[PDB]
Amino acid sequence: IDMYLYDDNEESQVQFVGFVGEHSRYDLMLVHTNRHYGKTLVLNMQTNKFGIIGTDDLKEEGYIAHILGVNAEEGDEITEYLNEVIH
Amino acid sequence: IDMYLYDDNEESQVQFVGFVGEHSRYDLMLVHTNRHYGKTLVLNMQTNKFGIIGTDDLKEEGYIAHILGVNAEEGDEITEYLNEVI
Amino acid sequence: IDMYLYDDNEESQVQFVGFVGEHSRYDLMLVHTNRHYGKTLVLNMQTNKFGIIGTDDLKEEGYIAHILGVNAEEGDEITEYLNEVIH
Amino acid sequence: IDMYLYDDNEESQVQFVGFVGEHSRYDLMLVHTNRHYGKTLVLNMQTNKFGIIGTDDLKEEGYIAHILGVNAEEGDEITEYLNEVIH
Amino acid sequence: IDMYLYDDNEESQVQFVGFVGEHSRYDLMLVHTNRHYGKTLVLNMQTNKFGIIGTDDLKEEGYIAHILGVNAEEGDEITEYLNEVIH
Amino acid sequence: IDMYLYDDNEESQVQFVGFVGEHSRYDLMLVHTNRHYGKTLVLNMQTNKFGIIGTDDLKEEGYIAHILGVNAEEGDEITEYLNEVIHLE
């Protein structure tokens, strides 16, 4: 409780959605920062979990479901929604 | 894939700590907004769990450890760090 | 297929509600006929189970959970809806 | 408990049929609608299960039986009966 | 927020009129519906008051002027228009 | 009293709801047109006031109570209600 590594600070922006799929409710939160490399922070605000996301993690199926903790059906639903707000 | 309930916006301050306690290292990034007000959220970056936290979540022994998936020590080593911040 | 008994088609008021609970999406359908004892027939459009409901079935708890095949978070929420609408 | 998605009340005739086959009695309820125009739904009333069934769903074996939770021998008959009422 | 009393629907002919008097502008919105068969209801779009007017509520001095909350000058100029619409 | 600007008419769905809150009895009428910025036209059918309500008009506190002319106890019950019967664009 003695040594620190880095304590930086950056004021960017956080978005709060709340879209709805076919049998599923989604409540998300998105943070995008130049501290990373394009991929934005994506909290699933219904499982208290999150991931660091770019075009190549959308590419890789198995993931969005695995990271945000939502079964395959839900995964694709948010994968298409993120395939519109990711650049 | 068809109806959005709501999609608000809030520019926010971002905090990214890194520190190392007695038995493990911690890599977290805090975020604070108006939505939850006197409740800020932390992003344990090694664990990819997270939580929305005020004074009265900190006072609940067992919680902060459970919320982000960690051991007892990590629960006090992080709950120690957070104590002064908020 | 060897003998028919009855083929009556009375006319009946049906209702396609859909909504969103704390975490959950519901899609329902509510058919009040004459052929029932003033009771409302509730299809769960997404469990493909249904119930003919009184007030008397609402009070008895865990019922809607059971009869529509949802857990008692959902079942409670759906019940919470049914009490509001009774006419 | 909040944000309703849709709430379309509408009136519609709902056929109840009973008939009987080689071994068991069938009581059903056919509800047709504008809604999912290419399909009518079927309420097995002894089983409190039901299905949204169109010409395509009746060429799929072990379907009605699974969907109606009935026997294979049962579903086939119901299928038999549904041919004459939907086409 | 429990026990609803009624949740009806009515397709309706709603029309909007804008006219300019000697002094003022007027923006009204008539909605005729069955649910009040006798009477056309009249929103004054710039005053956020409204009311349900019969053939006989026009023949009452200063009533129109009140219901929509306007000066006897405006009240007249509207009563003028509304007289061509009711009977 | 001498020149008109527009005499447009439209087909429109009108909802007529009423229910019992924990303190009074609300009698509403709701008219959704394709002429207002995707907004709903809430009539308080018992005070003869009305407002063009959107997602926003709601969060602007005390709003509903002021416009439909009800004390904000009554205000809240309705805001709560309208909150479930309202979307965006």
Summed up, what is this model?
With 87 residues, chain A is α+β, with helices and mostly antiparallel strands.
Radius of gyration of chain A: 14 Å
Multimerization state: homohexamer
How much strand of chain A?
Answer: 25-35%
Helix content of chain A: 25-40%
The sequence of SSEs of chain A as H and E is EEEEEEHHH
Protein name (chain B): Cytosolic protein
InterPro entries (chain B): SAV0927-like (IPR021415)
Please describe what this structure looks like.
Six copies of one chain form a homohexamer. With 87 residues, chain A is α+β, with helices and mostly antiparallel strands. The first copy, chain A, has a domain at 54-87. The first copy, chain A, is built from three helices and six strands, in the order E-E-E-E-E-E-H-H-H. The first copy, chain A, has helices at residues 55-59, 63-68, 72-85; strands at 3-11, 14-16, 19-20, 28-31, 40-44, 49-53. A four-stranded antiparallel beta sheet of chain A has the order 2-4-5-6. In chain A, a hairpin with an 8-residue loop joins strand 4 and strand 5 (40-44). Chains C and D meet through strand 1, strand 2, strand 4 and helix 3 of C and strand 1, strand 4 and helix 2 of D. Strand 1 (3-20) of chain C pairs antiparallel with strand 1 of chain D, so a sheet runs across the interface.
